[PDB]
Design a protein around this nucleic acid. Sequence first.
RNA 1: CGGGAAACCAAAGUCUUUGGGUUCCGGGGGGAGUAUGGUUGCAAAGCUGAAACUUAAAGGAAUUGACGGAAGGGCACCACCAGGAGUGGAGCCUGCGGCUUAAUUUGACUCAACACGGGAAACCUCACCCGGCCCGGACACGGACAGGAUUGACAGAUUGAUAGCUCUUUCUCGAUUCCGUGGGUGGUGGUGCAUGGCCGUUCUUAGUUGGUGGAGCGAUUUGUCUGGUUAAUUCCGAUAACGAACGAGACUCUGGCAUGCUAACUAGUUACGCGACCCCCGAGCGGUCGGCGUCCCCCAACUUCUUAGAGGGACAAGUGGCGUUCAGCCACCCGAGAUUGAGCAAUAACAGGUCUGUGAUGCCCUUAGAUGUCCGGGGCUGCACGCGCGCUACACUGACUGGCUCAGCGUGUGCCUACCCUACGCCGGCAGGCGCGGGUAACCCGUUGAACCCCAUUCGUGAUGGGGAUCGGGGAUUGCAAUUAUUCCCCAUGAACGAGGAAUUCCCAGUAAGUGCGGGUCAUAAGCUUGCGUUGAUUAAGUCCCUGCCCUUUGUACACACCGCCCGU
Length: 63
Amino acid sequence: KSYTTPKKNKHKRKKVKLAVLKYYKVDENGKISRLRRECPSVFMASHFDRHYCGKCCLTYCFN
RNA sequence: CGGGAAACCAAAGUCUUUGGGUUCCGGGGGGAGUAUGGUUGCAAAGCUGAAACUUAAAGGAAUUGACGGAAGGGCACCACCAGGAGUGGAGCCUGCGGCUUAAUUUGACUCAACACGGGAAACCUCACCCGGCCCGGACACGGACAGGAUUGACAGAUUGAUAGCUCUUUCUCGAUUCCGUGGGUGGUGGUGCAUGGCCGUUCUUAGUUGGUGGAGCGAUUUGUCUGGUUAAUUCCGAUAACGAACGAGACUCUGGCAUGCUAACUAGUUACGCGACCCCCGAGCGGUCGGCGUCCCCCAACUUCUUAGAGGGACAAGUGGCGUUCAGCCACCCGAGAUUGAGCAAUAACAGGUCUGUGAUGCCCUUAGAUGUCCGGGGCUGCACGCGCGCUACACUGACUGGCUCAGCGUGUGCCUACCCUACGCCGGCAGGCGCGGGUAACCCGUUGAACCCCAUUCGUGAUGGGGAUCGGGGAUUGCAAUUAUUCCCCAUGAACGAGGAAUUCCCAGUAAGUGCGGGUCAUAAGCUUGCGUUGAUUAAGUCCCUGCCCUUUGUACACACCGCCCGU
């Protein structure tokens, strides 16, 4: 069992959508512009070099 | 008569209902019959004789226990005698302390610990030491709750691991998350000296209470005994006790044997029909005979063996001795001659073990840098040592090799869960492997065709081939992982040990003792333990000599009770 004081941390990588962050662009009515790669089926954009989803979980790794 | 604390007393009586006359003398215990003073004494010493201080009890009689190197009866191989096999001595496997280590986790200490916690731990179990995830933190009190919290997932460094642990941030369950206060659920964390329950032991002997009655003021006592008798406070008796309950015994299971009974293709059948099949396989030309490793349907005969239901049977009954001639004992034809072995088990207890079996639990510890849980690798097994249960031998009644033939309890597959028992054919020396055909079982394993033992060869008193430790190389198995070698096989090294000091345990009949086989632990499996069967004695029919036990009589300055108390430089 874990008996020792030194772990140096243990916490959650807290996530927020409370911040101001645009996922599409502010265009005229009837036309929406996508800043990053997002699918109709909606979060597949590059993280830093890979793609992964929450509702689909299809890992893109060479495109 | 009557006194007295009572043991006792014709005085220790005539004592609160006290007064016959008179002498000496004591006021809690110790310091003390000490110091000093007086006095007698040849000397030893005698007579008279304080206080300071210290202490809560000293002290008498009886009552129950405990105890006795105290007597009287009696029982027990956790006792001895007569013996047998053993331990201690040597190799080793497991438990203990000490040493050691991050940790080598802990309980247990004469029987009543030390092969015990089914404690044979690779992980797991793991409670120990080194690291890493999680909140399975109920609910409510306030916030965060609309650019709306908070899930989590490979980026790449990092970590040990491809734990988005983190760093880093991109995705969602979206108000079930998230932060402080309140309540800790949780815990193999501490106290078995707070407990429950369950066990062990005192204690495997025969002992234990109360109702009414009698005695003592009383604690207590009698009933529970003078005596004989039995395994037994089991009886007959005796009797200021009577009538009853517990323990014993009685009861349950087990072994015996019942040529009688209802029964059996999942048992025997086995006797038979010889309904067939086979070998001249032999006396036998041959049949009948002997055999079958065989083959049958039930329209054979049943139940001796196989199984298990009711039965049945043994009860000091028959006879003879011994006895207060009651309880009973000894011997003998009969036959299971009352006799197999256990289970069960009272009164009062122990600061006997267990909080490490439990959602059984009080209190304390702790609860997020967790004493909760999960994961990784280790450790519980480490070596100058001493210990306690055990297997192996030290050999010739033996070992190596071949033939030979016989057993009984059980056990065995899909369960909240992961693998059972194994015939039979081939491959492989073997350890093992591959198709496979049975079993949830009187069905196939398995007619369980086990071992020492029975009959032959080799070895030749020699550390020899007895012995099988240690070490190297190899070959397979179960598993997420075998290295500090899980097991098993093969070659090979071939040590300690020449029957074991002081001590000490177990046993009296299919018991000791030898050999083998099941169950348990068990994915891998026993040198351990719980059971089964086979081979089969010598030495006893007794005593208190030792360690101990029950009852009675006596003794005590003991009462957490001889592991007691207690005396002086």
